[PDB]
Amino acid sequence: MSKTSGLYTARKLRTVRRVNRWADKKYRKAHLGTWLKANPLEGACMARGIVTQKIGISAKQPNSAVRKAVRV
Amino acid sequence: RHPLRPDPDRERRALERAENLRKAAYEMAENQHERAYHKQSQIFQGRFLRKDNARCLRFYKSIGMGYHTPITAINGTYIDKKCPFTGNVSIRGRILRGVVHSAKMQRSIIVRRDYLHFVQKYKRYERRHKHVAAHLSPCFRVKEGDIVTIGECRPLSKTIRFNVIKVEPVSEAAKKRFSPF
Ligand SMILES: [K+]
Ligand SMILES: [K+]
Ligand SMILES: [K+]
Ligand SMILES: [K+]
Ligand SMILES: [K+]
Ligand SMILES: [K+]
Ligand SMILES: [K+]
Ligand SMILES: [K+]
Ligand SMILES: [K+]
Ligand SMILES: [K+]
Ligand SMILES: [K+]
Ligand SMILES: [K+]
Structure with missing residues (x-):
């Protein structure tokens, strides 16, 4: 039946779901813990810092512009 | 106790279990490998010297x-x-049944109890088991697979x-099954 049935298979049905849950990129990003470590804001809405420089950044292929930004 | 003692005429002869217990007690005195002399606390040890037989030599009770x-406890020498x-x-407390998982300890056995656990999301069950340690009197002898009934007492050891x-x-050589009871 491509999935196990039977009145005494709750343990298997739970193990399969626990294992295959990690295959989703959304769940893995939000639950693994590496993104929390690598996040510059450390899981916060906002953060304060001091400006170290002023810069201009080229746009991508179909557009043409110089966007204005700051290294913080 | 309304009725009183019907009449067999071999009772006093059949109380030769007195000399039985007496010589078992005198055998315990000769096993000089032991360090302590083992005896029941309910029994004097002056009742063995007497000959008029008028006093009991072994103590036992009913558990309700x-x-x-069992008669093996009433006529034993342990x-x-x-x-x-x-x-x-x-x-006193809970009374349960299980199967003998292991009988490798000294007057102690392990008992395997089986049960079901319902998981509601999946609408199904899983089989679960636990192990319980229990004390084994010499008045029984068991092997792995036998069914036993055990009852709760005060703490007796760590487990x-x-x-x-x-x-x-x-019977030995039978298919082992879940057997919850
Ligand atoms: K399928
Ligand atoms: K499927
Ligand atoms: K499957
Ligand atoms: K079934
Ligand atoms: K799956
Ligand atoms: K005893
Ligand atoms: K059950
Ligand atoms: K349960
Ligand atoms: K199961
Ligand atoms: K102990
Ligand atoms: K102990
Ligand atoms: K089974």
């Missing part, structure tokens, strides 16, 4: 709950302070809180 004393029939403990009070034999 419709569980009768000493066990943890035996529920001839020792110094009592049965034991139960005592074997009934045995249902199971």
